[model samples]
Target: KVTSSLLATGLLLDITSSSASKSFIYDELLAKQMAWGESMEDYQYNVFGRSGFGGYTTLINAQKMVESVSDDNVNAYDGLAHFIKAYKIFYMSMEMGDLPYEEALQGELGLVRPKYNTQKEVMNFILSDLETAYELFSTAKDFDGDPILGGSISKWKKATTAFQLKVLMHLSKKESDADLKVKERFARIVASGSLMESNEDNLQMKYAANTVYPFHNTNTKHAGYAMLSTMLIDKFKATGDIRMFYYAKPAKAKLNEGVTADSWDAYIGTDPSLPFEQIEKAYATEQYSGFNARYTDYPSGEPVVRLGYAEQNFILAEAAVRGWISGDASAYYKKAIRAHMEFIASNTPDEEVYHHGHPITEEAIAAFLETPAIQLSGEKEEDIEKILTQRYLASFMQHPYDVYYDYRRTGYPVLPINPATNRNTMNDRLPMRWMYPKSESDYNLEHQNEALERQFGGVDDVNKLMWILQ
Candidate 1:
């Protein structure tokens, strides 16, 4: 399968740029990008949008590479290839809401402009493909060149199952309209016992030494333009969370002067929605802390996430809370937090470089767990909110797109709307979805217009809520 971080940069930006509710910025010009609206021009959605499409294309091309393999070997190759294709389609479906999948990749048949499929249709297709991949993985022989999973068939099964859970949850809002049995399917997946249960099953893209870490590259070039969000820092501080130190660094001025105490006082963040002029004023005084060294200076050089154990546990917690599965919500929530903490401690720092600011210890995690706000509240609604809030915090830089989707699904992380800077088409409402890529409206006008009209009732604005959100 493909392993390059270069292809992920654009998709990463498309997701992270919008879900950075917990990040701060200081550049006056850059500050305008924090929110979305009519004023927010559509530019690179096409450029980056191709990453997901390219992934699908690669999967198709790779399938050809495995065409001549024996059945025993084909199982492994096909399973992995199917997973990659499903994930790429899933990413695109989430971004564009609907896609041209069944008729897509059929250029040989002269279907240059394939008709688009509904979100439901695409989601079903993804789930079906993953189900096939999961079965193949069950009896598949081992293979090589699988960079993400190290040729582990069991890990591929877990990734497929975890991805299935993600798809099920995306369709959770559509329980009434589903052709597939949502509740039954979710329960079946949970009972299968093949899903990501620990950090070892996490889907991560590992980078080599001295390689360009995507975030580090972005932050280094755009230094003084982004900062830790006060909202994020405050949440950590309120809960006495130890991950705060790992997530952020002391201010540049303090770090430059060798004042490297790991106190909350050393790490301050600017308000995310402050006007550009105000942001510039704050930057003049070096009033905010930037991303931790692991993300900026001496990075770990790998972004270790696709779907992680923590996210799976959180999904289980939510499912249990919603009565879709039989389990203790509190127990699942606790596991999620524990998994996230351990993951950050081990994975956030470069061991060879010998620079990890404040690694979470057993003592630190236990003590933080004992905090009143962190302990399971026992109330269903409140506990559900708590579970999702922690998930949001856990996903900060790694899974921002998932966080944004969770907000759309459950509205838990109750973010403040910046009256001055908000780009919401609806007053005080977050943008519901991305506008279709400009290229679709240009080169594929007739088909694109048909899909837009069918899905959006003739309006293709960012504010138009999609079926999953409807």
Candidate 2:
């Protein structure tokens, strides 16, 4: 729902004379309150809620879907869809326990006031969905032009198998015997089928430059906030990552230095190899706001969902580090980081309009992996936290609310308080769940009150823990 919703508005905002109006909606989804303080609704999620909702939605739908047979329409399509959904839900439940589930599907439905489910139950549902999805796709002939699986039984099987590994690793904090299972399952996925090995197979979307609506880069400001975030710049510099060049132009100008970022100080002469024309071409005027650095320099449209291969590899690398999986974690970690670099290098075109390019070489990948800043092991827990935190950072812009949820779940990449609000002190603790929407309490008053009491035991404060922690 969130993906489709944003997919629509994001494209709408990318083109036409009304780009700013559309960009406002897209930016708010990722930015803090902009107009009338409504920005919080999207930013809170962009940072927290946006990225994680799809995971839960996928998982809940799976619970009902797994019971299907050929006779059932919903179940038939649930294999690829269910796995994606389960991954999305896992992403959600991990962040805030007792997340609004079955009952919160829509505002019109009284389900908005539904009681929260335990994290254990939620996770179990996720695991079950993967297991079922894997089983169903293994031999079922019913599969079709699934955007995710493409009717390939073997690939779908591998995806599900790997998803299982992901679930086990997530359960590490609780399951005493998790390490062995994590190792076993991860190995099974790699041994059996395709991984997000190359850029072409990357689960991303390509927006047309000439398109008039939701399919363009206007909504994301790929040249803007994406460029400004200290997170990407700092990380790229710390590790000497080359893709930084691909995604961001040198602060200075050349013949074709890509696009000039709004409010960004020129690098002066960072990459001296280029000539003046290249630099000026890269530095466009305010007339083309869509091409302005204020939105994003990188491709505005990048597809993301359960198991960003980079994310998956990072998880596996961690799993490997702990002996939860085979192969050196560093290798997988390098693969993960390199994959992201490749994403920018290959998917981002060379010219101002062409964001897609070629993959980085293995040598480059290894060099980045070895960078002191990129390598997470042996660092202080705080530094280790930075590496883990980047997982959330990379997730930003692409998935609206996911990264924030991960921060809540793992308590890594410690975020600063909201300086603009009285609630600035609220960042110290993890927010367990959200209050029922205003409409729910208004129309479904009795059920809303009961669900709230059932979920939180009467406390609606942001600091309260959900059922999982208690």
Candidate 3:
């Protein structure tokens, strides 16, 4: 939600930060990121790059804001700008491998293609950037915003600390030594201030239903084109995870006044000409209609999430699993499960039952996570599958990319064989890296191709693996 440029900058950084020569990191980094699990259809599943806005990339724009700022009418969104920029960078390198580093925002006048920094170096840069951000918040003499925080800078700092925990946990995937670092970071944040302790602090970017342009699902095209593949859907169903009710609505059922099963199915069939009224019906009837006001009559200003507390609890659970903290992994895991259900409950319609397939209370969640009835330690692979698989379902479309992201990092819930495909099938390997933006080659031609040639070994496909895989 923050206007940060880390996506572009961190990605570039991920590719260049290798201790080895550019050629070595380039080939591996691109493969790991771009070519790992691609399909012919529009950059299949490579969410980050596809959404990576060019020219508006983090570093480029942040510098623009800063340079344009002056005492009289300085740019007001500095804190958000810094946070998002840093996150973009953090994720780029996290999702990819090592990266090229050269103060990317300064690329306008002089530096374009930066030197490669190793994975470790990229993490250090992120941590350091966070420190700088915290410092900035500490010193803010005056600021202006919509008063989401009552103009308190400390809240921003607290949010940054939570984000830092997320970054550290991701690093924990690769670095064995990261346990202590994660502990230290979490402790630092906990000691300084609480970290998103309540649902109120949940970070979201709300879509408005106001007159100018009513909030609409911008993802219709994405959903239609990427028809919820059976293999994908089955993965959730197989686990009997109730989170599915919140993700995909049953096309076979109808809830709105005029919607029929056929109309809903036609809607799902990707009919672009369907009127807003028809689409509105689909939104109303579908169990999955979003919490956005465009679809529902929910109050305004609900936030769009870059991250949420559910995932944070999951991170804590995993850390606990590794014995890095005091709480039990099972306890943290249960909290994550319940929080996800509670979030969906709050978002669903009151007229109809929000939870359909299974019971969704805290007791049900705990039972599922612990008993052989659902999945726990002693049960078969299928049992354990149900637990983690629910995690996947809970993170559906909202954080669609997270399941895939987790697959790359943890290889969980066991993705099913992809539905009918002709040219090639994704191997057992989950995708390792995000594809470079297609526009990169066209716009940032010189550096794009340079990075591509070095990382992809000339292929530039999205299915290849970077050095980390080996």
Candidate 4:
């Protein structure tokens, strides 16, 4: 629910438009400029400028709901609400550095303007809250109307566990024996694990049977505007990965008609940061490939994932590679790929717009896995790169921001930069974080300025690294 709605609106399109502009449709002028990049000083308020407010409001509402219920005999609703609140808090922290956590939702106590907590403080609180949530959910029973996890308390428990793992991993970079702390947390979770053990336990928002998939709807309304990114398509081609067929479509004009999906010539992706004139010249030929027909043309498509087994496996793989866990990183990596392949083949509907008559087969999966590029190297860093790269591909439409986060964290899947037309002021490097909303300076200047000072030395620099990255 959080992903299909918030991130779909907030991150992916914006990145395709701005961050990876040349990789997708490079037509929109603002997108190209955004790719070129600007400082917070130049950016006016954005459409989702109030995203942090929405997340805070959701967290507050969830806390209120929990307060209305009995803590002594908490049901699945209370447990779920608590987990939702935790997720909201975690998300807000990621988006905006420091936030009003302890002092928030206390308007009744005469604290109108709440003080903000440091990023580390906020993350520590999230970790503690998730721990409490895990215990509360342990007693949960089945209930109806839980659209995300299908009212399955077991899956909810698994989701909470996975989320905990993610937060712990994010803090792995902190210097003061933080790696040791993360190792301890991983040991604890693995010892009593109920995490997303399979694809079925993956957290996602299933679209209603008749309603249009929101992304498909958006793409259809903006035809010729959104297309595959060159970084993505080129990687798939170079690796002989077949998931590209599911990710993108052959050009409507069929520049290389009847060619196989894995063929390098079958698909062509747009350089998102390309000059508008160049993109227009290419579009005149009607040869640039767009999103798959099923994803764009169909009324309804696949569910949007929030968290999944593939992500969990990658996290475990990373932990194992870093010597934080006892599992085999190679096994975990292979499982991650297999889980994603199954997810793409089975989770997506067999609508006519897809054009592909058959799903990816077991034999094909085996062959793809056996490819030299697909196989994991014994070297730790290389294996981690491969794990994250596969993750980047798996999370195409469902979780682009997660891929963005992976890039921020490890710089894997080495994305390209357009030196000729790129707008970023970081000597041509890609962005590290988004600028704070203009509303911060407009309505919450004091607190926002304080956050900037504490976090980035009083600069709202998009290139400034955050706590997780630091």
lDDT of each: 0.66, 0.46, 0.48, 0.64
Candidate 3 vs candidate 4, lDDT winner: 4
Write the residue-wise lDDT of candidate 4 on 1-470 in tens digits. 33222322232222122221222222122221112111121111111222335555554445544555433444665666666656777767776677777776673244566667887877777777787778877876665545456667788789889988887777667625543366787769877858677898877755545555654555435533555667677778888777777777766556445666444576777665665566656566656676676665655556567778988998888888887888898888888888888877775665534635435779878788778877777787788788878877777665435665666678776765566655566536666666666755776688778988989999887677877778
Q: Which lDDT tens digits does candidate 3 get at residues 201-236? A: 665434433421112233221222122333334444
In the range 97-128, model 1's lDDT, one tens digit per residue, is 77777876673245586777888888888888
**Ordered list by TM-score, greatest first:** 1, 4, 3, 2
Please give the distance, in angstroms, between residue 446's alpha carbon in candidate 3 and its true position after superposition: 8.0
lDDT of 2 by residue, 105-156 (tens): 5522334545555566676666766777776676455444344444456555
Q: Give RMSD (Å) of candidate 4 vs. truth.
A: 6.2
> Residue 30 lDDT in model 2?
34
Each model's total of backbone clashes: 0, 61, 49, 10
From the highest lDDT down, the ranking of the candidates is: 1, 4, 3, 2
List TM-score per model, in order: 0.83, 0.64, 0.65, 0.83
As a TM-score, model 3 comes out at 0.65
Candidate 4 Cα outliers beyond 4 Å, as residue runs: 1-51, 70-75, 107-110, 175-180, 217-219, 253-264, 349-358, 442-444
- What's the CA error at residue 16 for candidate 2, in Å? 23
Worst 10 residues of 4 by lDDT: 38-47
Q: What shift in Å separates residue 364 of candidate 1 from its native position after superposition?
A: 1.0
How many clashes show up in model 4?
10
Between which residue pairs do clashes occur in model 1? none
Comparison by lDDT, 2 against 4, better one: 4
